[PDB]
């Protein structure tokens, strides 16, 4: 009955360093929606744990050359963690190498941009090359465009790909600052856009959702914990706890 190693990633308001005038220890060092979720999972299912930040700082994507995965997905594959509790998108390509619990939140890719412009959709971005746009490198949004067969999205990936180092960023925070400082549109997940626009009155979502997906807890393929976590999540959902947590962290 050893403590489980839970990998996650810094992402407001799901996971962040808790601030305090005095020293913090162990799990108390972190806070956020996913941290509250993890706590609930541990008491419902009866396990102890330790929080680890994904070492390469990535969510997870497959390398073009060697086909190897990185990020949290890879840490689960290599059994460097028992669980991945973070805003981790459940995707078909990931389901091939790791397992996911049922979703604890639903969302979709959308566009973050400055308000007061004539850009009103992805098509408005794809039809021009002046305004640059991108996404978080090695994340689910990037992979969506990289694998899309939809004309507009295919051309958008061709654009991003050709300017990979200039338009792909290392985090949502970096993408947001890019939007606030230059003529740049950012492809990010709707749930995070909701949080951002609520705090940056000069920003807004552009258009609707480009796709639909959900966040789930990740486990190494075959892990006996996956089905147990799904039971816990469904219980939290039904009792309205997940709704309560969303309200608390989004305000």
Q: Which residues bind a second copy (CB under 8 A)?
A: 19-22, 65-66, 77, 96-97, 102-103, 106-108, 115-118, 120, 204, 207-210, 212-214, 221, 234, 237-240, 243
> Residue 188, interface with ligand SYM (CB under 6 A)?
yes
Q: Considering the complex, what minimum distance in angstroms separates the CB of residue 21 from a second copy?
A: 5
Of 57 and 207, the one with the shorter C-beta distance to a second copy is 207
Task: Write phi, then psi, for 113 (nearest 5 degrees).
Answer: -160, 175
Q: Considering the complex, what minimum distance in angstroms separates the CB of residue 2 from a second copy?
A: 24
Q: DSSP letter for 15, please.
A: B
Q: Considering the complex, what minimum distance in angstroms separates the CB of residue 247 from a second copy?
A: 12
**Piece in contact with ligand SYM (CB under 6 A), picked from 25-33, 41-49, 97-105, 134-142:** 134-142
Known binding residue 141? Answer is: yes
Q: Helices in the chain by DSSP H: which ranges?
A: 33-45, 71-77, 92-95, 122-126, 140-147, 151-162, 164-167, 172-181, 190-197, 225-238, 241-250
Q: In terms of C-beta density within 10 A (0-12 exposed, 13-18 middle, 19 or more buried), how is residue 177 classed?
A: middle
Distance CA 202, CA 181 (A): 12
> Residue 135, interface with ligand SYM (CB under 6 A)?
yes
């Amino acid at each position: 009955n050893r403590s489980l190693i839970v990998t996650t990633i810094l992402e407001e308001p799901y996971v962040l360093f808790k601030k305090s005038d005095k020293p913090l220890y162990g799990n108390d060092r972190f806070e956020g929606y996913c941290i509250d979720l993890l706590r609930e999972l541990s008491t419902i299912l009866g396990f102890t744990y330790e929080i680890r930040l994904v070492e390469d700082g990535k969510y997870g994507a497959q390398d073009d050359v060697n086909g190897q995965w990185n990020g949290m997905v890879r840490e689960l594959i290599d059994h460097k963690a028992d669980l991945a509790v973070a805003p981790l998108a459940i995707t078909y390509v990931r389901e091939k190498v790791i397992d996911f619990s049922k979703p604890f939140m639903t969302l979709g890719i959308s566009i973050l941009y400055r308000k007061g412009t004539p850009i009103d959709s992805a098509d408005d971005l794809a039809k021009q090359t002046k305004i640059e746009y991108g996404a978080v490198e090695d994340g689910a949004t990037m992979t969506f465009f990289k694998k899309s067969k939809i004309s507009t999205y295919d051309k958008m990936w061709a654009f991003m790909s050709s300017r990979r180092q200039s338009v792909l960023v290392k985090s949502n925070e970096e993408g947001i600052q890019r939007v606030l400082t230059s003529d740049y549109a950012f492809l990010m997940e709707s749930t995070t856009i909701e949080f951002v626009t609520q705090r940056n009155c000069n920003l807004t979502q552009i258009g609707g959702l480009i796709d639909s997906k959900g966040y789930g807890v990740g486990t190494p393929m075959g892990s006996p914990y996956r089905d147990k976590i799904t039971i816990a999540i469904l219980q939290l959902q039904e009792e309205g706890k997940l709704h309560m947590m969303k309200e608390k962290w989004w305000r």
